[PDB]
Design a protein around this ligand. Structure first.
Ligand code: HEM
Ligand code: HEM
Ligand code: NA
Ligand code: NA
Ligand SMILES: [O]
Ligand SMILES: [O]
Lengths: 713, 713
């Protein structure tokens, strides 16, 4: 069936904004997963998981009698799709059970791991999500084999359809770099937002870069991909060596024996894939990656044998039974146990990427320290495993259950506890009137609150106005935030705060984070008033102010908006059209297409554009909250043409007189071009829509202001 | 960006069930279009439309100073996508303003027509939908030019994204037959459910079949396509000759001058398309179809000139200025006016497909009768125009406003008005006890009510249980309905009715239509009881019984299910896999994926399968309402393989013993294979979900029982 995508493959795709509707969810619209989880007997779930670790099923026999290794890899892969550039991927929505991730080559036989968990999932039902179960199972695997984890938080709600993520443009699974859709350019520069070296891999190729078994070059790819997953050199070494302390790889015969991935398999396979014609197709004959490596002498127990073997031997390049490159310890005894036959033993083996931990000079230093000090190794691995598997969970307020670590970590962008009474509705009214009496304009107030709140992204739940980090490095200096204007607004707001707080009794006070949001609310109310409408913009107090020392400035870098259509801002020239970047921002903000449309039309006429640009400011009453953007955009008495100077800027001229009326960007004019967006603009641009436009604008402004407010959840 | 569709282009697409969510709709979920329309000043809208007809805009000047012909074609095209096979297409959702229909070649320059209506749409806002406006504008164009319409009904609610329709598999616009995705096979057999000869056409090719100018062969395509749009020979002739009394075609220069369709055009085109480099690109220089034909001497007035010219002249094959085939009247004077230049006049011209009305023997007799009896032509065209433009509006109870024709038409599947008191809750209890005491089984009662209610389709709002048409030809004879078993259930129900009705006072009675549904509800209640649950199933009385004479047996043929996954029924072998057909049927029933899942799992265990097939009956307590379908399907202790005798039937065998436990179809197993469907099945298959399953099942059963109940809406 030929689709709109086939006819117009470059047209903007709005469906990504309309995912996760209540139509696709089988739970009541009332279902609260946090409340269900809070009543889960987590201890009982862990005891069941513990038993499962050594209860082999004959349809996928457990290596060494212990599923621990397999489950660790499962939880690692669930988490390891995460990219810092957009926060997409990660373990937080249990997306490994859906396409495409369920069928990535790197996820081969994790279909079997997930199926082994069905009986426990079935037993506990809605009180434990798949997303939480995958991570928990990983933790129980580690604990069952003698490793002390740093902790565990529940609260990852299940989802019911595939997330729309850009994983790359390649049309061939695992395509080597340099093809017609190469994700590499220049001196091996990986395209943002991607965080893996080949389509269908979690991070790097375990044979080495494009299959070239050089551990020094592999180290480069490791370092780059792991950084793009929020991990530094210490965390990377800890994770790889920690993981590869357990279990084994599977490459017992040629890869050609392996059939279709799950999404391609026949219906009868019941959601499993990679059915193998090699001998029994499982157990001792398993083929997963095609590599056949077992790293330690006790694959089912925590030890410091990974580094003892890495540094205790010299390594020789060899081939698995499936033909993959891998390494074997020169002149070693057969000291590594066989996964099924107690009478066989094998020499130590390693991947190319394992050897990176020794042959990269910076990794080597850390690996030596971890070798000499296995207690440091254990603690670094525990912390890194916690971080990895919880990186996309968002603020600490979302962490559920009795194993949540009490130590607050810098990577969490922590928010201090509130220790005083909150402002009430009458206090909020007084503060709004003071803000407005200061002489701050609607434009300044709206632009500042937008800048503070619109850092939120629903992908990993980072950002938002809580914390008042707009006043700290690096946010205060981001170009989109207009650093000089921002400084003058913040100074005036801080003087208002200091006076309000100084006047109170009982220790009531207002945070700067709250006041920034409230002040924007006052701006919106005033804009409505300027248009002849009396509205109260909702406001919920309770934000707190974080310090500079509680803010990792380097981690904060990935939240800088280089594209923000809502402020008509583009930091530079990009390959992706601006309107695509707008829909990407809207999705990160959790906005629907109608919410995106209302919000953008209102921001334009409030003065939110960076640098006071007139682009898309289609009104003669700037700073009044009206639907003028839509009425003027849709007026056929205007003709639009790209400018000679810049094809991405358009002039709107009266069709009769030739007089210049307006200018706009692609982000402005798309609402008059795209057939679904223009249908939305028409609603807001109709004669009966001024009151609806105001109400809808206020609702979406409030939604954006509260995106990070999991403390009120 | 490589998508799931690219990787696994044959995987089932569930997004079609989750369209039209409240996320994409800019109106509140409270918005009621019927109530908004009820308050529209329809008279005022029509006066503005009348004014519009001769208010020429310079960006698309009006032919002959009058846009009537253009607007008639617009309305005709809005309605003319309709297919009887599935009820999809038609005017009822205003889908002409979205992709792909906004950019079909046959809809060229209708973007201009719609844009001319923007100021009126704007002025009246939500009180008139685009969908209603398009048809109304057509009506006003006809009235403006002297033709009295049969009527007009509002109530077509606007939609906010493209409908997912199968329009054909061809990858080239207007591809001629016999290509690698040919919609034709055999003796010019058009594939169901299609109702046009080429991708991007409304019905046929105006040059003739695949561009061959033979009017007799063209007539065959016309007859077949129009039949598939619910039009017989009399309605077809009336429509074509009626329509082509007005206006003109546009082919002033070569088609190479015409640019990108709306969905391909530059952003600056602001939703418009087909920008032409031929001379002024518009008006006298317009290029639309590439044909250059004006049919009558008074193109802006109703006349009887179409048939006078058709029969009054002999016709010679010629070429338009764009090179298209068309016909000119042999030795005629220049009697046809020019659309722009009062000093030019033209000979009469016709399309191939117009000549079909004379050279096809059956059309010729009708065309001669219309030529000799212009009153009959008028009334037939008015009736056909009303039918065409309202065919997908559903039951009469949805027709709004003061122009609704009072005459009840057979094509409307009319339901007699109820003229008596309805049963109350005490009566409903007594009828259900009598039903259950009769000895009819759960399986009988469920199967009969499912058969009655599940004829509904939301695409054109035909079918459903109202009317009791299950007792009439042809439904009573359909194989899916199990005619012998059906007759025995209906006989026992009719006896129950006759006794209940005989015993009443005050003229209270129950329809057979109501009783069928109530009896099914008793079946479901009894099934719940069989499983140890106490459940009341909701029931809304008020259906009436239609007669045989009120049920057109030929029109009812297209609602026969050849595929009904909910009864594990397939009438023959098809090119579309069975699970695709299931999702298709779910969409027509207005079900979401979770609703489809729960409903199908419950029907399997209640005994709703046609022929009492065991396929998917995964329970040992048949006729008890449990979630056994899900628990057993998801049991990994069973391995599934296709049977040798039939690759579409599967055997589920114990993994340890090899013993046969169950058999299933693709419709059964898809719920264990597809990754989104299996996530749904898991929810209902969990240990905490038995109560949830029962309640959700009752909700969806009730939904289906009420699908056609617009009398209560
Ligand atoms: C450079 C980064 C990494 C690479 C290239 C890599 C590669 C691989 C490969 C190819 C396999 C074999 C799959 C098979 O055939 O069964 C595997 C197994 C494994 N990996 Fe990794 N890995 C990396 C990092 C990690 C991390 C960060 C963890 C966890 C902290 C982890 C834990 C494991 C475990 C437990 C197994 C054994 C699975 C089993 O016993 O069945 N790996 N790895
Ligand atoms: C055999 C079925 C039909 C065919 C092949 C056909 C074909 C065409 C074509 C090719 C055009 C010219 C488009 C252009 O170049 O601007 C046209 C115009 C038109 N058709 Fe049809 N038509 C059919 C049936 C109908 C019917 C059923 C109606 C209405 C009841 C209708 C009403 C019109 C009108 C009013 C125009 C004139 C448009 C204008 O003045 O701009 N046609 N038709
Ligand atoms: Na994420
Ligand atoms: Na329809
Ligand atoms: O891994
Ligand atoms: O037409």
């Amino acid at each position: 069936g030929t689709s709109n995508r086939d006819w117009w493959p470059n047209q903007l795709d709005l469906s990504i904004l309309h995912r996760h509707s209540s139509l696709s969810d089988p739970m009541g619209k009332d279902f609260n997963y946090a409340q269900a989880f809070e009543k889960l007997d987590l201890a009982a779930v862990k005891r069941d998981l513990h038993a499962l670790m050594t209860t082999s099923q004959d349809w996928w026999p457990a290596d060494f009698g212990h599923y621990g290794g397999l489950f660790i890899r499962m939880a690692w892969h669930s988490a390891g799709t995460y990219r810092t550039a957009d926060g997409r991927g990660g373990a937080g929505e249990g997306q490994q059970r859906f396409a495409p991730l369920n069928s990535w080559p790197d996820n081969a036989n994790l279909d079997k791991a997930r199926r082994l968990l069905w009986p426990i999932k079935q037993k506990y039902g809605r009180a434990i999500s798949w997303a939480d179960l995958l991570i928990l199972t990983g933790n129980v695997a580690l604990e069952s084999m003698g490793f002390k984890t740093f902790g565990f938080a529940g609260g990852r709600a299940d989802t019911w359809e595939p997330e729309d993520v850009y994983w790359g443009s390649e049309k061939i699974w695992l395509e080597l770099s340099g093809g017609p859709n190469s994700r590499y350019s220049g001196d091996r520069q990986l395209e943002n937002p991607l965080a893996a070296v080949q389509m269908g891999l979690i991070y790097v190729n375990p044979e080495g870069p494009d299959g070239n078994p050089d551990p020094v070059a592999a180290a480069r790819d490791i370092r780059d991909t792991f950084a793009r997953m929020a991990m530094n050199d210490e965390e990377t070494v800890a994770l790889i060596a920690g993981g590869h302390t357990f279990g084994k790889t599977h490459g017992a015969g040629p890869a050609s024996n392996v059939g279709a991935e799950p999404e391609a398999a026949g219906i009868e396979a019941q959601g499993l894939g990679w059915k193998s014609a090699y001998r029994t197709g499982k157990g001792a004959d398993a083929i997963t990656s095609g590599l056949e490596v077992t790293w330690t002498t006790t694959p089912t127990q925590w030890s410091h044998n990974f580094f003892e073997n890495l540094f205790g031997y010299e390594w020789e390049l060899t081939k698995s039974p499936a033909g993959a490159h891998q390494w074997v310890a020169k002149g070693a005894d057969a000291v590594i146990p066989d996964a099924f036959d107690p009478s066989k033993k094998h020499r130590p083996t390693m991947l190319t990427t394992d050897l990176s931990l020794r042959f990269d000079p910076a990794y080597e230093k850390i690996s030596r320290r971890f070798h000499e000090n296995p207690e440091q190794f254990a603690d670094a691995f525990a912390r890194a495993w916690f971080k990895l598997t919880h990186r996309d969970m968002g603020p600490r307020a979302r962490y559920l259950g009795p194993e949540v670590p009490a130590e607050v970590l810098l990577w969490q962008d922590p928010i201090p506890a509130v220790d005083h009474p909150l402002i009430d509705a009458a206090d909020a009214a007084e503060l709004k009137a003071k803000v407005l009496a200061s002489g701050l304009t609607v434009s300044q107030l709206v632009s500042t609150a937008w800048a503070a709140a619109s850092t939120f992204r629903g992908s990993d739940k980072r950002g938002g106005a809580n914390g008042a980090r707009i006043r700290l490095a690096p946010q205060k200096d981001w170009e989109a935030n207009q650093p000089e204007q921002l400084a003058a607004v913040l100074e005036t707001l801080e003087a208002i705060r200091t006076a309000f707080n100084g006047a109170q009794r009982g220790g009531k006070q207002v945070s700067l984070a709250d006041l920034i949001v409230l002040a924007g609310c006052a701006g919106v109310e005033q804009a409505a008033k300027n248009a002849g409408h009396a509205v109260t913009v909702p406001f919920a107090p309770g934000r707190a102010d974080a310090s500079q020392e509680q803010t990792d400035v380097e981690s904060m870098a990935v939240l800088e908006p280089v594209a923000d259509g809502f402020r008509n801002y583009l930091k530079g020239k990009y390959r992706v059209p601006a309107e695509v970047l707008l829909v990407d921002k809207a999705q990160l903000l959790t906005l629907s297409a109608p919410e995106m449309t209302v919000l953008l039309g209102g921001l334009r006429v409030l003065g939110a554009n960076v640098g006071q640009s007139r682009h898309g400011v289609f009104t003669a009453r700037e700073q009044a909250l009206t639907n003028d953007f839509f009425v003027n955009l849709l007026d056929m008495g205007t003709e639009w043409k790209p400018t000679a100077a810049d094809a991405d800027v358009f002039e709107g001229r009266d069709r009769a007189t030739g007089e210049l009326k307006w200018t706009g960007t692609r982000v402005d004019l798309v609402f008059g071009s795209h057939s679904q967006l223009r249908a939305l603009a028409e609603v807001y641009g109709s004669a009966d829509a001024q009151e609806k436009f105001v109400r809808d604008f206020v609702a979406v402004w409030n939604k954006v202001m509260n995106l990070d407010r999991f403390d009120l959840a």
